[PDB]
Structure formats: structure tokens, C-alpha cells
Amino acid sequence: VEWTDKERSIISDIFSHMDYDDIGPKALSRCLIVYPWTQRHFSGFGNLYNAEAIIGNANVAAHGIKVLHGLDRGVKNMDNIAATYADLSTLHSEKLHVDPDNFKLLSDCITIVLAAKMGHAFTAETQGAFQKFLAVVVSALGKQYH
Amino acid sequence: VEWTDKERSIISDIFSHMDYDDIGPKALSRCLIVYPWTQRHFSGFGNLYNAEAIIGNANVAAHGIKVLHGLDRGVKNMDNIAATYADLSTLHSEKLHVDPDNFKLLSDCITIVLAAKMGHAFTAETQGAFQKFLAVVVSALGKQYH
Amino acid sequence: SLSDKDKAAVRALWSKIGKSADAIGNDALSRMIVVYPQTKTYFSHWPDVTPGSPHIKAHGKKVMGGIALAVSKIDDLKTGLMELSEQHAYKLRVDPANFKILNHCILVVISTMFPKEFTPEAHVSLDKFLSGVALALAERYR
Amino acid sequence: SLSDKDKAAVRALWSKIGKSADAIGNDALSRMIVVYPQTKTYFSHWPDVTPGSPHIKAHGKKVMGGIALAVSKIDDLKTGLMELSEQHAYKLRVDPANFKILNHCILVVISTMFPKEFTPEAHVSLDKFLSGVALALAERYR
Numbered sequence: 205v206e207w208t209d210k211e212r213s214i215i216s217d218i219f220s221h222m223d224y225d226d227i228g229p230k231a232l233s234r235c236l237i238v239y240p241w242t243q244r245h246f247s248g249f250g251n252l253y254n255a256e257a258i259i260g261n262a263n264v265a266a267h268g269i270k271v272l273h274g275l276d277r278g279v280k281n282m283d284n285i286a287a288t289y290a291d292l293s294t295l296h297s298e299k300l301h302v303d304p305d306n307f308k309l310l311s312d313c314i315t316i317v318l319a320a321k322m323g324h325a326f327t328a329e330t331q332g333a334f335q336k337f338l339a340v341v342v343s344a345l346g347k348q349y350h
Numbered sequence: 351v352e353w354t355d356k357e358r359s360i361i362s363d364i365f366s367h368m369d370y371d372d373i374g375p376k377a378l379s380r381c382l383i384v385y386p387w388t389q390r391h392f393s394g395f396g397n398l399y400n401a402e403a404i405i406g407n408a409n410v411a412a413h414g415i416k417v418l419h420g421l422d423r424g425v426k427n428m429d430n431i432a433a434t435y436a437d438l439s440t441l442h443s444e445k446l447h448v449d450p451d452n453f454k455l456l457s458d459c460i461t462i463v464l465a466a467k468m469g470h471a472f473t474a475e476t477q478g479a480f481q482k483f484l485a486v487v488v489s490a491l492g493k494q495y496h
Numbered sequence: 497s498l499s500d501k502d503k504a505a506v507r508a509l510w511s512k513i514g515k516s517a518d519a520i521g522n523d524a525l526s527r528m529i530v531v532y533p534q535t536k537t538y539f540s541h542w543p544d545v546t547p548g549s550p551h552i553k554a555h556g557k558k559v560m561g562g563i564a565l566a567v568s569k570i571d572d573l574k575t576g577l578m579e580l581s582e583q584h585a586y587k588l589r590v591d592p593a594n595f596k597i598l599n600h601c602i603l604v605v606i607s608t609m610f611p612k613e614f615t616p617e618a619h620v621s622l623d624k625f626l627s628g629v630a631l632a633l634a635e636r637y638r
Numbered sequence: 639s640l641s642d643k644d645k646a647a648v649r650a651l652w653s654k655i656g657k658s659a660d661a662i663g664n665d666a667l668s669r670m671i672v673v674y675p676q677t678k679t680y681f682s683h684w685p686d687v688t689p690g691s692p693h694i695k696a697h698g699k700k701v702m703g704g705i706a707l708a709v710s711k712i713d714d715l716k717t718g719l720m721e722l723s724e725q726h727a728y729k730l731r732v733d734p735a736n737f738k739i740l741n742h743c744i745l746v747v748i749s750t751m752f753p754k755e756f757t758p759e760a761h762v763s764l765d766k767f768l769s770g771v772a773l774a775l776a777e778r779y780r
């Protein structure tokens with residue numbers, strides 16, 4: 205990845221203004237509804253056979269905030285993302301057994317939730333930069349799978 | 351990309367034994383038959399309207415051989431593949447207008463025709479190194495599309 | 497396949513947002529070409545393959561016209577979109593992988609314009625429907 | 639969708655190769671876990687996630703029994719594979735992207751084992767069929 209100054213500015217601006225306790229729960233809830241195989245890693249969170257059950261589920265919500273703040277270390281390390289996420293990649297692989305394709309699916313849900321919050325301000329260029337950042341983190345999160 | 355010595359050896363081994371005049375036309379004809387939208391660029395090759403016609407088409411054969419030999423520069427530049435293919439990338443984007451997803455489709459057809467030729471010798475590890483190589487070339491081929 | 501639940505959800509959402517199909521189309525196709533520039537290969541005939549251009553704007557109306565037709569033909573997308581399938585297979589040769597990319601851009605546009613209407617339940621049904629549209633447009637390819 | 643031409647081709651290929659189903663299945667799952675190691679996340683309950691291992695050979699039998707089932711149900715894959723869809727949906731939670739990975743590996747295995755039989759025409763039809771099987775396996779997911 206090579207970042208333009210404009211991409212760095214957009215990413216910085218989105219994360220300085222992000223309401224994590226709003227976007228986190230919404231993005232993870234929307235992922236468990238739209239892509240329900242992602243519920244594989246959440247079974248004991250309670251009964252998630254329902255969209256209301258899921259969106260109500262305070263375990264889901266707390267996990268959505270934790271995973272969204274997992275993005276902060278890449279914002280602070282934009283030229284060293286692969287290495288920064290190496291330990292988290294190894295964890296998801298060897299401890300949590302998370303299919304890394306699910307990282308792309310949650311990314312798309314984070315994008316869609318962010319777009320609904322930002323509205324007309326989520327321009328094509330803003331979407332490009334933001335999806336570029338998530339794509340570099342998703343790759344990093346999948347790197348240590350062996 | 352980081353190459354292991356074993357990957358280097360498998361790749362060099364495959365390309366030192368390749369019969370380009372057999373694999374190249376088989377891989378491109380198979381792509382044009384399995385993925386017929388890849389015909390988009392070849393309207394002046396003559397007859398393509400059915401499988402028999404494509405398999406018997408000598409312009410498709412010739413181009414098959416050319417594309418397969420376009421892998422040779424990456425075998426020779428294994429740590430510099432993106433730079434080595436930048437001019438080809440630009441050609442395919444700007445002059446030829448080829449959708450780079452088609453690179454991936456043709457790649458899978460080269461793998462399947464190589465598998466039929468190699469038989470039992472196309473082992474899982476052989477497949478993994480060969481497909482890793484092709485994916486790094488396909489990434490380089492798409493890199494200069496903007 | 498689309499359940500009765502999914503069809504009701506798509507019809508209900510389209511009832512609410514259909515009025516804005518033209519704007520949705522301009523925005524979605526502009527996003528496609530900016531964020532996924534490789535898609536520009538199919539528009540090489542046009543001098544203005546830039547977001548919100550005359551050509552992209554007018555094409556956006558047509559594409560979303562196609563979506564409106566799909567809603568109306570939601571009980572049988574294959575038959576409904578047959579002519580469009582023929583055009584994309586035989587004339588344009590658009591790799592069906594790119595339908596996935598436009599579909600994601602359509603979802604992003606509807607989320608930016610209709611945040612209240614685009615609930616997670618609206619989204620799962622619309623995503624199933626747009627996948628069904630992509631597969632019906634692929635019907636005449638091979 | 640599958641035409642009568644496609645259905646005949648899949649039936650004629652399976653008539654030729656079906657006796658080798660169990661070996662195809664171990665070869666294909668072996669290739670999937672070696673070439674796409676992220677797929678090993680579904681087999682975490684096994685210690686022997688290695689090519690050719692007893693859980694992999696056993697399980698390759700079941701998968702290609704599923705392909706045989708699908709050939710017998712080729713006129714209506716959705717109805718025919720509903721129980722397997724429900725198994726992968728609720729119990730196994732397998733992301734449908736991995737069906738695309740396995741399907742590529744099954745084609746590589748058949749090419750290595752039946753090069754004469756796996757003609758380009760057999761391949762376009764079998765690819766369409768396995769895409770239809772992947773879609774039918776996703777039927778109960780959402």
C-alpha cells in the first residue's frame with residue numbers, strides 16, 4: 205500500500221469523528237443478519253435466531269465496539285499495517301478459528317453503516333479511501349493464517 | 351510476496367518442462383468456452399461461435415502461446431514481478447481495455463490444463479505454488495488500471 | 497431463492513425509494529467507476545468516464561430502469577431479464593463478476609440516501625434480490 | 639440455469655467418473671486445505687487436518703456423495719439439497735465463499751484424473767452445475 209496525502213486525511217477525519225458505540229453495534233448486528241454464518245463465533249452470546257434478538261443483544265453490541273476499535277492501531281500505523289495486525293491475525297486463526305472471508309463481510313457492513321451515518325458526505329472518493337483502508341486491514345488480518 | 355526455495359524450485363521445474371505449444375492453445379480455448387465473455391477482445395480472430403470452432407481456431411492458438419510465454423518474465427524476475435509487468439498492465443488497460451477479472455479466469459484455465467497434462471504429478475503443493483505465482487502475476491497485471 | 501418475506505421486503509422498499517431511481521443510478525455508477533476503476537474498461541467508447549458525467553448520469557437512469565423491471569418481475573427474474581441477459585452476454589460481454597461490484601455500490605447509495613428505510617432486514621432481502629438479478633443477467637452467457 | 643445440454647453432459651461425465659467419487663473427494667479436500675489453508679478453520683475439531691488424513695478421506699466420501707445426490711437431483715437442486723443446505727447453514731455455519739474454493743479443487747482433481755473425459759464442453763457444463771450446487775447449498779442460510 206502506498207497512501208496519498210488525501211487518503212490519509214480522509215481516513216484521519218473519519219476516525220476522529222466516528223461514534224464507536226453507535227457504529228460498532230450496528231455494523232456487527234447488520235453482519236450477523238445479512239451474513240448469518242458469521243454467528244459461528246457468538247453462540248453463547250444468547251439466542252441470535254431473530255433480527256430483533258440480535259440487534260437487542262448486548263453481548264453483540266459490546267463485541268461490535270471492540271472490533272471497531274481494533275481499527276485504531278492501523279490508523280495510527282498506516283505504513284506498517286501488516287506487521288501491526290500480525291498478532292491479531294494469529295489469534296483469529298489459531299485461537300478463534302474465524303474464517304477470514306468474514307473479515308471482508310464485516311468490512312462491507314461497516315462501510316454500509318458508515319455510509320448511512322455520513323449520508324451525502326460519504327462521497328465516492330471517501331468510500332474509496334475508506335474501503336482501501338479496510339481492505340489493507342482485512343488482508344493483514346488474514347496474513348498469518350497457515 | 352515472499353518465496354520459499356521450494357516454491358522457486360517448483361515454479362522453475364514447471365516452466366522448464368512446459369510444452370507451450372500444447373498448453374497455451376488449450377488454456378485459452380478452454381477460457382473462451384468456459385467463460386465466453388472473455389471473447390470480447392478477439393472479434394478479429396475469426397470464427398468463435400461454438401466450442402469446435404474455437405478449438406480449431408489457429409489465431410486463438412497463437413495468442414494462447416503468446417500469453418503463456420508472457421509468464422516467462424515473472425519466472426525470471428520472481429522478486430520484482432509487479433514492476434516487470436507494469437508496462438503490460440498499462441497496455442491491457444489503456445489500449446486493449448481488457449477487464450482484469452478475465453486474467454483470473456484465464457489463470458484458472460491454465461491451472462486446469464496444466465493439471466490434465468501433469469496428472470498425478472500436479473500435487474496439492476505443486477498446485478499451491480503454481481497458483482501463488484499466477485496470483486502474483488495477475489495482481490501485477492491489474493495494478494496499473496486506474 | 498427469494499421467499500415471500502424477501503419479495504415483500506423488496507417491493508416495500510422499492511415502493512418507498514423508487515421515485516429516486518435516477519439519482520440512485522447516477523451515484524451508484526459513479527461510485528463503481530471511481531472506487532473500482534477497472535470497470536471503466538466497458539465504457540472505453542465514451543470520452544467522459546468520470547463521475548456524474550452526462551453519459552454516466554444517463555446510463556444510471558437506464559440501469560436503475562433495469563432494477564425497476566426486476567422488481568416487477570421478481571417472481572421470475574430469469575424470464576423477466578432475458579433481453580437484458582442477451583444484451584450483456586452477446587453485445588457487451590460484461591464479466592458477471594462486475595455485477596457484484598455494482599450491486600455493492602447500489603447498496604451503499606441506498607444507505608446514504610434512505611438510512612431509515614434501509615434496515616438490516618431490508619438489506620438482507622435486497623442483497624438476496626440483487627444476487628438474483630446478477631444471476632438472471634448471467635443466464636444467457638454460457 | 640442448466641439446459642438440457644448441460645444436464646446431459648453432467649450425467650454422462652458422472653456416469654464415466656462416479657465410480658471414483660471417494661478418491662475425487664479425498665483429493666479435492668486435500669487440495670483445499672493445502673492450497674487454501676484458511677478453510678481449515680471449519681475442521682478445528684479435528685487434529686488430523688492434513689492431506690489424505692483419515693478425517694479428510696472419510697469426509698471426502700461424504701462430500702462427493704453429496705455431488706452424486708446433486709447429479710440425481712439436477713432438475714431441482716434447491717429441493718434436492720435442502721437437507722445439506724440446512725446442515726451447512728445452521729450447524730456448520732460455512733461461509734458460502736468456500737463452496738467456490740472446493741468447486742475449483744474438484745475441477746482440478748477431475749482434470750488430473752480424467753483428462754480425456756474432462757473436455758472443455760464437459761467443463762463449462764460441470765462448472766455451471768457446481769455453481770448451481772453452491773447456490774442450492776446456500777438456500778437455507780438467509
Ligand code: HEM
Pocket residue numbers: 242243245246270271272273274275292296300302306307310311345
Ligand atoms: C475489521 C475486522 C476485525 C477486527 C479489526 C477485529 C478486532 C478484534 C480485536 C481487537 C479483538 C480482541 C483481541 C484480544 O482479546 O486481545 C477481537 C476478538 C475476537 N473477534 Fe475479531 N476483529 C475483526 C473481525 C471479526 C470477525 C469478522 C469475527 C467473527 C465473525 C471476529 C470474531 C472475534 C471473536 C470471537 C473474538 C474473541 C474474543 C475473546 O475470546 O476474548 N472478529 N477482534
Ligand code: HEM
Pocket residue numbers: 388389391392413416417418419420421438441442446448452453456457487
Ligand atoms: C496471464 C495472463 C496474461 C498475460 C501474461 C498476457 C500477456 C500478453 C502479452 C505478452 C501480449 C502482447 C503485447 C504486445 O502486443 O506488445 C498480450 C496481448 C493481448 N492480450 Fe494479454 N495476457 C494475459 C491475459 C489476457 C486475457 C485474459 C485477455 C482477454 C481475455 C488478453 C487479451 C489480449 C489482447 C486482446 C492482446 C492483443 C492481441 C493482439 O494484438 O494480438 N490477455 N497479452
Ligand code: HEM
Pocket residue numbers: 535538539555558559560561562563580584588590594595598599629
Ligand atoms: C444491476 C446490474 C445491471 C443492470 C440491471 C444493468 C442494466 C442495463 C440496461 C437496462 C442497459 C441498457 C441501456 C441502453 O438502452 O442503452 C445497460 C447497458 C449497458 N450496461 Fe448494464 N446493467 C447492470 C450492470 C452492468 C455492469 C456491472 C456493467 C459494466 C461494468 C454494465 C455495462 C453496460 C454497458 C457497457 C452497457 C451499454 C451502455 C451504452 O453504450 O449506452 N452493466 N445495462
Ligand code: HEM
Pocket residue numbers: 677680681697700701702703704705722725726730732736737740741771
Ligand atoms: C461441494 C460442496 C459440498 C458438499 C456437497 C458437502 C457435503 C457435505 C456432506 C454430505 C456432509 C455430511 C453431513 C453429515 O454428516 O450429516 C458435510 C459435512 C461437513 N461439511 Fe460440507 N460439503 C460441501 C462443501 C463444504 C465446504 C466447502 C466446507 C468448508 C470449508 C464444508 C464443511 C463441512 C464440515 C465442517 C462438515 C462436518 C463434518 C464433520 O463433522 O467432521 N463442506 N458436507
